[PDB]
């Protein structure tokens, strides 16, 4: 079986990517709105099997960014609600995406590794998994004042939870 | 450079002056490095190494005792030195207490058995 | 089989072999025997070295009896002298082992020939025939705690003139006594007696000639002359508590000098006390 | 080009061990003084005569303060 | 068999882990003046185990109490360095041999040589009567003992004096396992 | 190999360091290139490996409800925090020199293979005895009076940010 044998550091820059929201990368392939990981991949180290497993995690978490870049996708191309909903949700992409963005310069210009980019982003990947559940009921559902008045009503359940 | 040059920067660095002033000194310095030069016992870091830690014990210090084991490996790891065992004899004979007999431990061996 | 050796060579196997005899191993050729030690090196061998092997082993046999008399004389029914004692006798050992350790790193360069052995062991064959001598008169007649320390005090003044073996004998009286130090300046400076292990000089009963009494056994032999002083210096806070550092050094009598300085109080306290 | 700054760095790195050994002996050297014990040691020279000059020169730059 | 593949066995034997296998690490070829050095080295590490087995054994049970715990928690600081010196030991395998390491593990014989006789002194000793079992280890005289036993008592005896600035400036002694000697009375 | 470990004790497991759903990690077989003692200390390794896998399943599956079990859950990770941290450095100091063996890669977990083990059982009662409600400020309680310094040290912190949850409601309420 024949395999690419890519760098290390090549494949953080392409988490990052993952992380951006951006599709159509060398890595995690995604089918059918599904981001998975590809097969042929493997480094010097880690055994071709551990890279499949540390991958799979952070491809778990490019299903929370996908789906959710997918959504404000669908509103841009009179709700009045998904519409200003969005805003907040999209004001906090620009945010997270900076901290990112800016963790790329310090590869281009300090040894920089797996171990070490996933502990620096330890609470963001928490902030990013309570999106996963609050989104999922404001997803699966068809008149405009159920569908608005169902999403307004989660999140001050939602934050009553967290008190 | 050569160690004749090199004497006179140490006799800038410990009393701060310039070459021109400070001549005194240098030559008192030239007198005993010189006749003195080469090594009079047989170089091993293994016997200075366990002088060291024995130092570190005696003032109750033994967390450095077990950090200079792993300082001292390092030194094996990158390779740049040539002759460790001399720059270890010397830093152990500046080293000074922040805070008796010595024919009954282990001294290193004299060189005269062999015929130099 | 040495017979089918040559000479220049079979002396490179012998050299290695007894460098392990000096560590308590035994050895290929020079076998040791049962229990002093004797040992056997062979029926044919070059005579021009088994006269020579017989030179080496006494650092071998002074050395399996002093490593004995450290993994016997630490168990705790013998006193806290003859502790310390064992403790400070055995970073000697240490060192002994260390200059076996630099002998096999040069033997490997070969530079190592039996001639030039016999004259890198001599510290060890001096040092290791003192503590095999003092570890022979200790066990002999049987001493714990003072009359430990009493040995290790003539000793030393029989070597007089040697000035390699006095600053020895000296380092281990230095590090003997540490602990019977430790419970006399508890009885000079206060009252208490601790001495776990009947070792001390002054003993204590349950009118007041049978409390305390010396033990005339367990007395320095060096503190002798003040046997008295001290037993009176306690004495005297005793009947006052229940109403309501020192160094070892030879030839300087700082610490005799330092018990007339106490019991020069001991009396004042009390004396005024009555009066 | 690159080995000539390979051992730039691996001379750094001992130069940085050295000075860490130094400092926990509590010797009064520092990095600029050190630098130069270290050449002279490297052409083979007694340490028992160069560590008495040291104990010397610092005996005397007191006589002088 | 070369005095290397030896010099690679030993530095696991150090550990529990075994040609040389597992009272005595008896060996099983080569000559006599190896395997007995082997054998007096490769016995330091069954004492290891012997050190080992308590503190595991006895961190198993919920039953100890709060000293069995700060002792069998204080075998292991004085374990972390002895896995340390097996570090700095491996590191040199890739020159040392049989005479070299008897200088190198010389005193490492000495503080498993107390640590390893002092769980057995104090086998079924629970609470106060432990912290007063390794006290008795004190009264020695040798400067390196002396001076390592009594560390583990300031270690073994800070839960006692915990209750007992707990039961003389608030009178509230609490211990499920009845460890303090004031034993109170529903 | 040891990039390679030091993600097997991260929560990944691979080729070389199977993964079994009753017993925990552990090596597969015995491996030509490396020694046939190492076989063991790995072992030994991974007693510490299945703590904090066994231990991230639970935190992220949140399980039984309630605050209290919630606010468990957001401490039991801070706790958790040096462990990551002293798994990161690891690489570093290899990174450095390229003589280190596993030897001392064991060495530097030291203080995780004491402490786990007994911030495991407080895990097993809640999940076997259905612990709900504020009864956890009692279970944690009474195993923070154990002996041994680190743990009295670890479940204080829990027990510190737990009684957050009643202070909360605590002055909600008065």
């Known amino acids: 079986d024949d395999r690419v044998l890519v760098t ?48 799979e995690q952070i491809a778990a978490y490019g299903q929370v960014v996908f789906r959710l870049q997918e959504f404000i996708d669908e509103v841009m191309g ?34 920089i590794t797996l171990a070490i980019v996933v502990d620096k982003l330890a609470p963001r990947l928490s902030q990013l998994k309570v999106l996963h559940k609050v989104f999922s009921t404001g997803v699966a559902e068809t008149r405009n004042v159920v569908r608005a008045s169902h999403l307004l009503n989660t999140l001050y359940k939602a934050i009553l939870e967290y008190d | 450079k050569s160690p004749n040059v090199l004497l006179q920067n140490l006799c800038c660095r410990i009393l701060g002056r310039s070459e021109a002033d400070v001549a005194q000194q240098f030559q008192y310095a030239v007198r005993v490095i010189g006749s ?17 830690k024995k130092e570190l014990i005696r003032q109750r210090r033994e967390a450095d005792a077990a950090l200079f084991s792993e300082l001292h490996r390092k030194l094996h790891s990158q390779g740049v030195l040539k002759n460790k065992w001399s720059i270890l004899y010397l830093l152990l004979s500046l080293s000074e207490d922040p805070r008796s007999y010595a024919t009954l431990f282990a001294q290193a061996l004299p060189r005269d058995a062999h015929s130099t | 089989l040495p017979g089918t050796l040559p000479l220049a060579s079979q002396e490179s196997a012998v050299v290695e072999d007894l460098l392990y005899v000096l560590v308590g191993v035994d050895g290929r050729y020079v076998s040791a025997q049962p229990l002093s030690r004797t040992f056997l090196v062979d029926p044919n061998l070059d005579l021009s070295i088994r006269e020579l092997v017989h030179r080496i082993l006494p650092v071998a046999a002074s050395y399996s009896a002093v490593t004995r008399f450290i993994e016997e004389k630490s168990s705790f029914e013998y006193g806290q ?195 | 080009a ?64 | 068999i070369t005095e290397a593949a030896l010099v690679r066995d030993i530095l696991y034997v150090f550990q529990g882990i075994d040609n040389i296998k597992m009272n005595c690490y008896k060996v099983e070829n080569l000559s006599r003046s190896l395997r007995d050095t082997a054998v007096r080295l490769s016995e330091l590490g069954w004492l290891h185990n012997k050190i080992r087995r308590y503190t595991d054994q006895r961190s198993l049970d919920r039953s100890f109490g709060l000293v069995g715990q700060s002792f069998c928690a204080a075998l292991h600081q004085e374990l972390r360095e002895y896995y340390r010196l097996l570090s700095v030991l491996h590191s040199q395998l890739q020159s040392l041999t049989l005479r070299r390491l008897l200088v190198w593990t010389y005193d490492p014989k000495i503080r498993l040589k107390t640590l390893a006789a002092l769980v057995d002194h104090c086998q079924g000793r629970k609470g106060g009567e432990l912290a007063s079992a390794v006290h008795a280890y004190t009264k ?21 004096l915990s209750f007992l600035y707990r039961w003389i400036y608030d009178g509230e002694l609490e211990d499920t396992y009845h460890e303090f000697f004031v034993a109170s009375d529903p | 190999m040891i990039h390679e470990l030091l993600l097997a004790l991260s929560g990944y497991p691979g080729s070389i360091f199977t993964w079994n759903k009753r017993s925990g990690l552990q090596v597969s077989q015995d491996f030509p290139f490396l020694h046939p003692s190492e076989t063991s200390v790995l072992n030994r390794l991974c007693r510490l490996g299945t703590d904090y896998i066994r231990f991230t399943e639970f935190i992220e599956q949140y399980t039984l409800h309630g605050i209290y079990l919630r606010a468990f859950c957001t401490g039991l990770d801070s706790v958790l925090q040096p462990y990551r941290q002293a798994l990161l450095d690891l690489e570093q100091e290899f990174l450095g020199d390229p003589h280190l063996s596993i030897s001392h890669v ?44 680190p743990v009295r040290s670890a479940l204080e912190k829990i027990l510190a940010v737990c009684h957050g949850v009643m202070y909360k409601q605590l002055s909600a309420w008065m």
Not at chain 1, 29 to 36: E, N, Y
Not at chain 2, 36 to 48: G, H, I, K, M, S
Not at chain 3, 200 to 213: A, K
Request: proline share 3%; charged share 20%; glycine share 4%.
């Open chain 5, 140 to 160: 020695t005289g040798d400067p390196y003992m002396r001076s390592l036993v009594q560390h583990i008592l300031s270690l073994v005896s800070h839960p006692v």
């Open chain 4, 2 to 65: 690159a080995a000539a700054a390979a051992n730039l760095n691996a001379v750094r790195e001992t130069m940085d061990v050295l000075l860490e050994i130094s400092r926990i002996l509590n010797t009064g050297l520092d990095m600029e003084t050190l630098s130069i014990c270290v050449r002279l040691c490297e052409q083979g020279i007694n340490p028992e005569a160069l560590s008495s000059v040291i104990k010397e020169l610092r005996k005397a730059t007191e006589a002088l303060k």
């Open chain 2, 36 to 52: 003195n030069f080469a090594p009079t016992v047989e170089r091993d870091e293994f016997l200075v190494a366990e002088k060291i």
């Open chain 3, 81 to 275: 002298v003859n502790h310390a004692l064992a403790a400070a006798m055995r970073t000697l050992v240490k060192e002994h082992l260390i200059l076996v350790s630099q002998l096999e790193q040069l033997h490997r360069q070969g530079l190592l020939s039996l001639q030039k052995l016999w004259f890198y062991i001599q510290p060890a064959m001096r040092t290791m025939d003192i503590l095999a001598s003092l570890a022979t008169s200790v066990d002999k007649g049987e001493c714990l705690g003072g009359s430990t320390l009493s040995l290790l005090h003539d000793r030393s003044f029989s070597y007089t003139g040697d000035s390699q073996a006095q600053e020895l004998c000296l380092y281990l009286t230095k590090a003997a006594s540490a602990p019977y130090f430790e419970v006399l300046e508890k009885w000079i400076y206060r009252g208490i007696i601790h001495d776990p292990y009947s070792e001390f000089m002054v003993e204590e009963h349950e009118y007041w000639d049978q409390r305390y009494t010396i033990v005339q056994q367990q007395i320095p032999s060096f503190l002798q002359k003040m046997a008295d002083k001290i037993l009176s210096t306690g004495k005297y806070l005793n009947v006052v508590r229940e109403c309501g550092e020192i160094i070892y050094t030879l030839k300087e009598r700082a610490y005799v000098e330092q018990i007339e300085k106490a019991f020069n109080y001991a009396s004042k306290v009390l004396l005024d006390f009555l009066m």
């Open chain 1, 8 to 55: 290390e550091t090549q494949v953080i820059r392409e988490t990052l990517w993952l992380l951006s929201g951006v599709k159509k990368l060398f890595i995690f392939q995604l089918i059918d709105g599904k981001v998975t990981v590809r097969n042929n991949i493997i480094v010097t180290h880690l055994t071709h099997s551990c890279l499949r497993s540390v991958l």
């Open chain 6, 106 to 149: 064991n060495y530097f977990l030291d203080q995780f293979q004491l402490l786990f083990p007994s911030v495991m059982v407080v895990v097993e009662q809640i999940k076997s005895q259905k612990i709900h409600g504020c009864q956890i400020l009692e279970t944690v309680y009474k195993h923070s009076c154990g002996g041994l310094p």
């Open chain 1, 78 to 111: 009179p709700f009045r609600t998904y519409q200003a909903f969005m805003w907040a949700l999209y004001k906090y992409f620009i945010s997270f995406k900076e901290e990112l963005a800016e963790i790329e310069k310090c590869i281009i210009n300090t040894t």
